[PDB]
Amino acid sequence: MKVELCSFSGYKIYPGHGRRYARTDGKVFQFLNAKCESAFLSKRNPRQINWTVLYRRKH
Amino acid sequence: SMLRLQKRLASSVLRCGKKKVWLDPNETNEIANANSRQQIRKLIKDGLIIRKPVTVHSRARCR
Amino acid sequence: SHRKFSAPRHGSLGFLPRKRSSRHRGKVKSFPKDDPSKPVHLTAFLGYKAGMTHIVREVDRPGSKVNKKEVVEAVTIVETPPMVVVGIVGYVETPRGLRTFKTVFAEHISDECKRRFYKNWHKSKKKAFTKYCKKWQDEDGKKQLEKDFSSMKKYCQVIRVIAHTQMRLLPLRQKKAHLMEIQVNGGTVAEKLDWARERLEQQVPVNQVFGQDEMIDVIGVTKGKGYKGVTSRWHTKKLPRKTHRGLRKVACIGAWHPARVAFSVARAGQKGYHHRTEINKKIYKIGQGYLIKDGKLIKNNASTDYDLSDKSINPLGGFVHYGEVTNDFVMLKGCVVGTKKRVLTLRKSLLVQTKRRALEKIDLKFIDTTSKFGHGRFQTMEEKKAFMGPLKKDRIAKEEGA
Amino acid sequence: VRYSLDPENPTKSCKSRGSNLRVHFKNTRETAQAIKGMHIRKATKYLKDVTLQKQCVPFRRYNGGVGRCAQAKQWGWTQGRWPKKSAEFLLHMLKNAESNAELKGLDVDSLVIEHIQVNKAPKMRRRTYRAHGRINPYMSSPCHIEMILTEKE
RNA sequence: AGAUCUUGGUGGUAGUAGCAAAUAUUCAAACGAGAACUUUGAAGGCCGAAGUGGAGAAGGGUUCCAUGUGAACAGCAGUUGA
RNA sequence: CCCACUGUCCCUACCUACUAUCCAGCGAAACCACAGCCAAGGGAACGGGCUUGGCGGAAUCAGCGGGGAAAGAAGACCCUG
RNA sequence: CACCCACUAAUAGGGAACGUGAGCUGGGUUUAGACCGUCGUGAGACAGGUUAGUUUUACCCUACUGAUGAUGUGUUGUUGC
Ligand SMILES: [Mg+2]
Ligand SMILES: [Mg+2]
Ligand SMILES: [Mg+2]
Ligand SMILES: [Mg+2]
Ligand SMILES: [Mg+2]
Ligand SMILES: [Mg+2]
Ligand SMILES: [Mg+2]
Ligand SMILES: [Mg+2]
Ligand SMILES: [Mg+2]
Ligand SMILES: [Mg+2]
Ligand SMILES: [Mg+2]
Ligand SMILES: [Mg+2]
Ligand SMILES: [Mg+2]
Ligand SMILES: [Mg+2]
Ligand SMILES: [Mg+2]
Ligand SMILES: [Mg+2]
Ligand SMILES: [Mg+2]
Ligand SMILES: [Mg+2]
Ligand SMILES: [Mg+2]
Ligand SMILES: [Mg+2]
Ligand SMILES: [Mg+2]
Ligand SMILES: [Mg+2]
Ligand SMILES: [Mg+2]
Ligand SMILES: [Mg+2]
Ligand SMILES: [Mg+2]
Ligand SMILES: [Mg+2]
Ligand SMILES: [Mg+2]
8 A cells, every 4th residue: 555666577566575775876776576686686687587577578 | 046156257258347247137046056167158158147238438429 | 700791691580491381272370350340251262373474554653753654564363263162160269379169061062172181082982071961951960050050159259261262163184172261350250150151152252352452462382493502592602613512502501619500501401382471462453254145255354444355364375384264363463472373372461551552543554465485476366367467277278178 | 950930830830941142131131021920922922012113111220321212101111122132032932932831731822921030141252442552341241041931811 | 458459250330432534325036044234137326547446576374266154253234254 | 914805703593414312233441438409517727428407209311511629640840858 | 900992871899719621712821842132161040032832531420401200189181279
């Protein structure tokens, strides 16, 4: 019933789940789990990971 | 009963190792009577003792 | 010589017999102070720790940083199917304590309850209470029961009811019911005797024992940990890496004098499976359980007035290691002692709730039902289906049978 | 040969004996104590169960370090074990005593072990090698056994 | 009755410490009174040519090789064995 | 002393192998006046025993290192001959 | 011990065989190697300095920690004080 967020993987993050990452540059990300977070931290492109929403929409 | 001697003699006759000596498990008693290299020689000819082939170490992957 | 720098001792001495609990159920050990002005009511209940989840709610604590704000809070689901009253105990106040004056048991004790009297129910011929129940129908037996009820009326101070859980309504492997004495508070001895008498063989739901957002106390046994060293048991400091005999030890277990090891020295032994009571556990909800009128009415288990979604308290894929919650349940706030499917005693508070932390109305907004068997990310089946669309397993299902 | 505890009448009785049997004395003493006074068919089934680890023998006197078991509750004890060699040796001695009863013409279906005794035999010397060039004994503790069975039903 | 006395024997400790260095065994059959340990076969592994392989010098002295035994020895067992 | 690095630490947790553990078989040694719960007293001035009090419930298992001024060595320090 | 930095409600003083080595460590002291200074004819000495220098044993009784059990209520079980 709060703001409903979307991950690096586009999945819907319900309140009380995942983490939030605020970089020094001023942009803020929210992740669903350490799999999605560490994928983002290793600079992997979600358009090339098949289970990601941005891949499904792309293809 | 025990074929320690026959396996040793069959190795020497076949000029192989004990690794490659095959004493027929069905004819344990027949092999057990062969207490000399001459009886071993006839066992090999008759087929109750077989020299097994070399374990395959192919070089195709290297080639 | 004195120790160089002061430091508090490890572990409390108020739990010193740190042994396996002699009981499994968890004894009340103190019922709330009985007063006659209040109406007749029960003081305890038996539930089972179904699992945990988290909720979202709006806080109404003025002067706080969370006032008019949403928070998430861990809550523990405890399944509480209605218990059955099967007996009455009288107690008399002697100058040596309470002593059990007289016990009266109802006719038609259920088979699940009679399992409690047998170490081997399978080989048993189930003869327990078969001659006792015969006295409820003959004249001399009934007249005796009248004399025993009247003797309780004029000689007993506090009376308690024997009540047992209905284990057949639970998904557990156990069929043996849990018996417990529940004190009847609030009235004269005659009044609570007449109340308890009419409840014999009847069912007492948790709605008539506890209420919404009242602080209760949870009594039970904690998780067992087996034999444990001093570092896990008493949380003492580890010795450095260079220690010869080992570092998960206590270096000095006493001075030369008093020439004996003191009882207050941390030592290795059984950890866990201890009988503990925790006070001030707020009730956030009391679910309605499943009910059939024309179909299976399941929505109101986890449907808050802001959710309006047809779902139960059960997570996706069921509660881990417990099963499916179907009966009425009580959603306590925060962690609770014990493993899953561990019997818990829920007791009315011995204190009086006057702080603003207590007597605060709870108004839920959201109840998490994602899968707890992993990193669940969907609340219901239908939400998962709408997000993913049809899959291969459902394609061939719609292809083979058309 | 000289037995201890000659029977009240050696007309309904049979005897068995063994000398220098290679079993542990402490184990056999506990096993013999368990089967004393038993009916012969009961001791036969019992000693077979001890080999199968279905019934334990209670280690009462020689119980230093002996672990606890659930089967000790058949007896009034807490510590018990299942000595396979002692049960084997007493089983052979029981078959020997049973055959003696067949020779004496009295029915074996009613024999009861009225007397049984385990004595220490002369020890057998072995050798073990220790830390700083030292030797210690590795002696064995064999045992003599005797038993007397009687007709009663 | 003593001498940390001499020699011999025996206890408690105690059925206790322990039988934990170098990856690992399993299935079936035979002989046999008896098989975790013997023999054969089938697997799975190891040494990996500076070897756990084939040969010697020194030293041992018959340990070599057949057949037989199952007392003692091979710190479990053995139908096996230096 | 500095950079880097890290469970050295904050502050500990979890996993693996071999043990320990229980069982079958086999099976020692050190040590041993008698033994073995304490407070105080007096006493070779720090008692397991003695006095006075506190008390005392078979048989045991796994640990433990406070005691037995524990064991190991007729003190190598110091004095005497 | 001391002194300094900083935090803090405050950063008090002590005992327990100068508590605590079969709990650890071994930095120091207090063996044998070695260097310097001073003393000594010399061997050598130095509460003078410096560098390298084996830390063993518990499985026994008790204590303590937990774990079975034991007495007696005819047996046995449930609930309890
Ligand atoms: Mg202080
Ligand atoms: Mg205190
Ligand atoms: Mg060290
Ligand atoms: Mg989970
Ligand atoms: Mg050795
Ligand atoms: Mg040597
Ligand atoms: Mg003398
Ligand atoms: Mg002497
Ligand atoms: Mg052992
Ligand atoms: Mg071992
Ligand atoms: Mg290899
Ligand atoms: Mg070679
Ligand atoms: Mg040879
Ligand atoms: Mg042997
Ligand atoms: Mg004292
Ligand atoms: Mg001297
Ligand atoms: Mg000397
Ligand atoms: Mg000191
Ligand atoms: Mg000490
Ligand atoms: Mg030390
Ligand atoms: Mg040093
Ligand atoms: Mg020096
Ligand atoms: Mg000079
Ligand atoms: Mg200087
Ligand atoms: Mg050096
Ligand atoms: Mg012991
Ligand atoms: Mg042990």
